[PDB]
Amino acid sequence: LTIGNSTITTQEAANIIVGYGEWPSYCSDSDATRPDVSVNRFYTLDTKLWEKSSKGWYWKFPDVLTETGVFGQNAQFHYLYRSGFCIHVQCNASKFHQGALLVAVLPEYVIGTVAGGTGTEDSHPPYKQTQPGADGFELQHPYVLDAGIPISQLTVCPHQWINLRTNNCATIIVPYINALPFDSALNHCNFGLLVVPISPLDYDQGATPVIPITITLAPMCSEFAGLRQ
């Protein structure tokens, strides 16, 4: 893609999947400024440690981007925000590497904490358990994903499978999907990113024990809108 000073090469001979094949539409109800010069540069999320004992990572959107990045600082001005997400997952392995990673996006993924004892009596999640920042937290038991959701039923939603054999990278376009076009920004959780490997990483001794996995995102439809309050 060549727009301005940006010059990158990607593979256009992959399986590009779009959710239900429908771009977001604009609302026309009555119930009630797009800078893309220094904001359109591609952002690379910090690399995760893909390792044999790695259990997976989860991220709440756009909760983790409310303040952390440039998206955070220019969302600190506008009360509302809505844009498309460019999923960018790539596999970098040699002829001696094995594995199979499953990546999916689940709208309205509810988080569940731990609650032991005979009597059901739960408290409210604290600040760090609700948003741990960029540090993240490794799933203790991904077989039901630390939330009572077993892996066997994650396929019911639009999904795709990652086989590192033929692809070198995968790009997924998920449109701005929501039940209410006018909704809160810092309150409602639109969706979350779950990366659950199926085949654990396998390699003989001598190779690099960690594979650098890259996550990149770009605003497909930058629209802050809203009003100053």
Partner: protein
Amino acid sequence: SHSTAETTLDSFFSRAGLVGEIDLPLEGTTNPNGYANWDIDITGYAQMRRKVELFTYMRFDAEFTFVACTPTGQVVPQLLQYMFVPPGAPEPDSRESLAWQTATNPSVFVKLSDPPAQVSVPFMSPASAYQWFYDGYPTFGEHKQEKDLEYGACPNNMMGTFSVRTVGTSKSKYPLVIRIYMRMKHVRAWIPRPMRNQNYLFKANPNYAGNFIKPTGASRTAITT
């Protein structure tokens, strides 16, 4: 059958299933004031909850019937009227509360010989679809310095409640048992969710037990069939 019209969604889902029995004995502690209020809870009964948990967002019309009888199955000549209180109007607290005077509800005069009346209410929820668990902050401000008890609370999501009471100044001399049958007519699927495999422990929270189980372990070995 041979025709595929019999095997459609209307006949698949059209089935009046029991939702609960209203206990109004001659004497008791639960409702000694001669009336009771029953909130409409779909998650209360397991099987209908398991049916509705396959989906999240949907659109249907509601029709209610009040089947009342004695524990012996006989009828008595007593005057009864079924009146629904809107959510906007507060629930009646005393026998002489002004909530009994809602003019918006028409009244029908019948006798127990007449089979139970049929009442229908449309989808009057303020939102476009049902949502029993609210993810997010109901407060629409920056207040996050105090104890946020609103997490999971929704003081706006009540659909109302029913008010069945003994009409008349004199106390009823007969014990009664009330049964209610529900079924969904117009079903549409908007946002699919995985159908629950692990049993729920509480109805107002998605919390689970610390000791998970396996759906089935009949297969001792993969070799044997």
